[PDB]
Amino acid sequence: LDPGLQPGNFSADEAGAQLFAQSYNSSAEQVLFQSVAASWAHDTNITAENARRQEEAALLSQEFAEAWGQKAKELYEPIWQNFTDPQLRRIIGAVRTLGSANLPLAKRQQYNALLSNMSRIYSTAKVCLPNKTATCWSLDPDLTNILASSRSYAMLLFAWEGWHNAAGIPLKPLYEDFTALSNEAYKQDGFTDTGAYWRSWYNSPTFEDDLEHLYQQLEPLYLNLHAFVRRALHRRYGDRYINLRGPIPAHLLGDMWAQSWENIYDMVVPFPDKPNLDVTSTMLQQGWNATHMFRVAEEFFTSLELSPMPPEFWEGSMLEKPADGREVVCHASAWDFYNRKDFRIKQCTRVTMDQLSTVHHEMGHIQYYLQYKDLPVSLRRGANPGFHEAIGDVLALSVSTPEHLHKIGLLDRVTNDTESDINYLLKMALEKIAFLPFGYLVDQWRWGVFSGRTPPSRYNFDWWYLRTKYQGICPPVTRNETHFDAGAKFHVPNVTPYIRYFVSFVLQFQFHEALCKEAGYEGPLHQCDIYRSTKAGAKLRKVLQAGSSRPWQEVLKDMVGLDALDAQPLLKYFQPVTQWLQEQNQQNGEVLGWPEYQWHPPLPDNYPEGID
Numbered sequence: 356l357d358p359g360l361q362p363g364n365f366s367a368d369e370a371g372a373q374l375f376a377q378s379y380n381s382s383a384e385q386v387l388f389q390s391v392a393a394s395w396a397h398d399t400n401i402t403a404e405n406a407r408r409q410e411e412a413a414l415l416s417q418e419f420a421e422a423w424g425q426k427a428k429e430l431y432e433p434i435w436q437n438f439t440d441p442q443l444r445r446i447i448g449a450v451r452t453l454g455s456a457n458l459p460l461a462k463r464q465q466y467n468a469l470l471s472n473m474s475r476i477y478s479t480a481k482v483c484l485p486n487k488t489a490t491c492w493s494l495d496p497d498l499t500n501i502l503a504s505s506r507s508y509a510m511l512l513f514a515w516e517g518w519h520n521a522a523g524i525p526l527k528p529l530y531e532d533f534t535a536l537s538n539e540a541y542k543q544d545g546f547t548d549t550g551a552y553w554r555s556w557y558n559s560p561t562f563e564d565d566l567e568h569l570y571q572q573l574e575p576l577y578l579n580l581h582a583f584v585r586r587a588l589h590r591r592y593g594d595r596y597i598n599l600r601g602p603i604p605a606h607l608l609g610d611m612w613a614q615s616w617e618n619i620y621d622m623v624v625p626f627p628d629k630p631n632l633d634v635t636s637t638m639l640q641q642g643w644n645a646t647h648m649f650r651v652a653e654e655f656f657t658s659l660e661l662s663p664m665p666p667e668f669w670e671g672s673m674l675e676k677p678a679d680g681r682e683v684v685c686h687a688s689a690w691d692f693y694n695r696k697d698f699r700i701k702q703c704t705r706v707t708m709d710q711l712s713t714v715h716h717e718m719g720h721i722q723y724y725l726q727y728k729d730l731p732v733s734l735r736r737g738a739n740p741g742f743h744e745a746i747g748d749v750l751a752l753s754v755s756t757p758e759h760l761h762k763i764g765l766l767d768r769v770t771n772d773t774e775s776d777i778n779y780l781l782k783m784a785l786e787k788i789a790f791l792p793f794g795y796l797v798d799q800w801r802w803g804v805f806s807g808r809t810p811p812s813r814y815n816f817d818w819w820y821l822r823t824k825y826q827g828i829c830p831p832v833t834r835n836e837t838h839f840d841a842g843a844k845f846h847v848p849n850v851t852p853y854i855r856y857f858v859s860f861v862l863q864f865q866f867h868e869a870l871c872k873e874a875g876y877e878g879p880l881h882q883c884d885i886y887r888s889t890k891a892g893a894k895l896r897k898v899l900q901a902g903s904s905r906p907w908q909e910v911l912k913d914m915v916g917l918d919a920l921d922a923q924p925l926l927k928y929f930q931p932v933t934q935w936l937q938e939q940n941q942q943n944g945e946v947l948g949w950p951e952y953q954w955h956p957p958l959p960d961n962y963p964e965g966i967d
């Protein structure tokens with residue numbers, strides 16, 4: 356649109372390109388700021404006006420992106436990839452990829468419409484009770500808490516089913532259309548489908564195989580945490596609802612998607628009657644503010660000689676579900692406005708331990724932003740999406756330790772023994788191990804939708820194939836191809852790639868090891884706490900300050916000593932409980948896995964009318 360943001364004109368030289376990029380950066384910062392700020396208004400407030408606006412701002416960006424896009428390749432496309440300066444050719448290579456901008460005007464508009472709509476359908480969805488046409492439940496908070504702490508099978512079933520129908524069914528038709536378009540766009544950028552484009556970010560001709568191999572190494576870990584919990588669950592709901600030889604029913608693991616079981620710790624905790632490793636109740640006791648949480652998280656960050664939250668962040672962030680009745684996308688996220696000034700976090704935070712680490716997780720994104728803000732805009736990325744999701748989790752590892760919790764107030768004791776040690780490790784196992792299958796599975800499903808191996812005619816049938824197959828969980832009520840359970844997961848509607856969370860969970864420990872070593876810690880990897888270690892923090896920040904300038908595979912070597920992802924440091928972390936669980940299941944005759952696939956639990960007695 357605006358002429359001042361249009362390209363200009365340059366030499367089909369590498370010296371021309373150095374200039375081309377220098378320019379793009381100054382202009383792009385504007386066009387990106389606007390589009391980002393527009394969204395920030397829509398997410399922090401969902402109105403038809405803001406959506407319209409957003410959809411507009413997107414059109415400009417798509418406009419901008421095309422101009423420099425087709426220009427950068429107008430004359431820099433038979434030669435880049437042979438440029439001396441790696442950073443330069445990695446920038447030009449980021450610009451030559453138009454993305455959605457390659458789509459005719461009508462189609463961009465359809466595109467942008469789908470996006471703001473799906474995210475709207477996803478965050479507006481509600482679950483209403485049968486007869487009481489009285490006030491509905493919302494994914495956050497109502498639904499989450501019910502899955503996090505309600506032990507009523509029927510009740511959980513009502514919310515699990517409620518949410519999955521409510522969010523999925525309407526989303527399906529739009530998803531199929533978004534996919535057709537998304538592909539069409541990147542098809543022109545040279546990739547087969549968006550799937551291939553998404554994986555090209557790791558630069559590894561071997562990515563998928565490295566991941567499949569990496570999973571086998573860990574599968575045994577999951578299968579054991581699984582049979583152990585499946586047993587604990589049988590113990591509580593009985594023999595009618597839990598099959599000791601079948602997949603677990605998806606709504607009993609204490610989380611809507613069964614992606615992390617840390618909320619059922621009190622039902623599987625091996626050695627109970629000991630100090631409780633869930634500050635979640637001491638946080639309330641002390642009167643923890645939602646802000647108080649973003650301060651403790653910050654404090655850790657500062658001690659490692661890393662920068663604190665800027666004032667803009669404190670003035671412009673939304674750290675609580677507002678009260679003006681405004682409707683917001685409650686999912687926690689971190690925002691980079693590409694203006695080296697504005698960095699904020701959007702999260703309907705309330706006072707919970709699992710929420711205290713999500714705060715750290717998010718700060719990790721902000722800290723990554725603050726660190727690389729001084730690089731060409733097109734390089735303000737993590738080494739790879741994985742590194743980004745890792746950053747806050749790493750520091751989280753040190754925070755979760757019982758020794759650290761005490762140092763800061765919520766673990767009233769200190770019981771240095773095995774039993775407590777096992778409990779801790781199991782708790783962490785419920786959070787990190789239980790997730791591995793899911794994290795893998797999601798983009799497994801998607802790469803196949805984008806490629807056509809999973810047409811809308813098999814959206815749900817291929818989703819539960821993957822879910823049963825990897826998580827060993829099954830749907831509590833029957834399902835069919837009018838359903839779209841994959842769509843009930845925030846990340847599918849809001850088009851976010853997922854294979855990054857897997858990478859993240861595996862290489863967050865490589866970091867944890869590497870950092871604990873420079874901190875000068877010795878003792879066990881799972882009891883390490885890099886707190887106040889300016890030496891450790893300096894090691895981390897070198898990776899941060901690199902953005903997408905250098906290949907992750909190099910930025911990783913410098914920091915960890917390895918050319919790639921490794922589960923070894925992860926196995927070393929959970930070692931004790933790894934052997935413990937394994938020994939426990941055997942004695943108790945458990946069966947690792949689900950041989951009775953195809954098994955489904957029956958409905959509550961009169962469905963669906965009871966104490967919800």
Ligand SMILES: *[C@@H]1O[C@H](CO)[C@@H](O[C@@H]2O[C@H](CO)[C@@H](O)[C@H](O)[C@H]2NC(C)=O)[C@H](O)[C@H]1NC(C)=O
Nearest residue numbers: 376377379380381382384694695729730731732
């Ligand atoms: C990309 O362009 C932005 C915008 O000019 C650059 O950021 C500025 O940095 C200078 C100092 O180097 C400050 O005086 C400005 O206030 C910053 N923003 C503005 C408004 O210009 C950034 O350095 C450029 N990146 C590269 C590598 O060229």
Ligand SMILES: *[C@@H]1O[C@H](CO)[C@@H](O[C@@H]2O[C@H](CO)[C@@H](O)[C@H](O)[C@H]2NC(C)=O)[C@H](O)[C@H]1NC(C)=O
Nearest residue numbers: 516517520815832833834835836837838962963
């Ligand atoms: C998919 O399975 C669901 C669950 O059984 C089906 O929905 C029920 O079907 C009856 C009629 O057979 C309706 O009265 C209900 O309203 C439906 N849902 C509920 C809340 O029970 C659905 O028909 C199935 N879809 C297909 C095409 O087989």
Ligand SMILES: *[C@@H]1O[C@H](CO)[C@@H](O)[C@H](O)[C@H]1NC(C)=O
Nearest residue numbers: 400401402403404405679681
């Ligand atoms: C919510 O969005 C509306 C219109 O998009 C806007 O007028 C209002 O200011 C926003 N809510 C606020 C500010 O509390």
Ligand SMILES: *[C@@H]1O[C@H](CO)[C@@H](O)[C@H](O)[C@H]1NC(C)=O
Nearest residue numbers: 465468469471472473529532
């Ligand atoms: C998105 O929602 C708006 C508002 O109802 C509607 O006008 C538009 O057609 C929707 N887009 C799609 C493709 O669903």
Ligand SMILES: *[C@@H]1O[C@H](CO)[C@@H](O)[C@H](O)[C@H]1NC(C)=O
Nearest residue numbers: 644645646647648650674675
């Ligand atoms: C309490 O929460 C409010 C609302 O976010 C915030 O303004 C205030 O700084 C918080 N106080 C503390 C000490 O956390």
Ligand SMILES: [Cl-]
Nearest residue numbers: 740852854855
């Ligand atoms: Cl990714």
Ligand SMILES: [Zn+2]
Nearest residue numbers: 716720743744
């Ligand atoms: Zn994240």
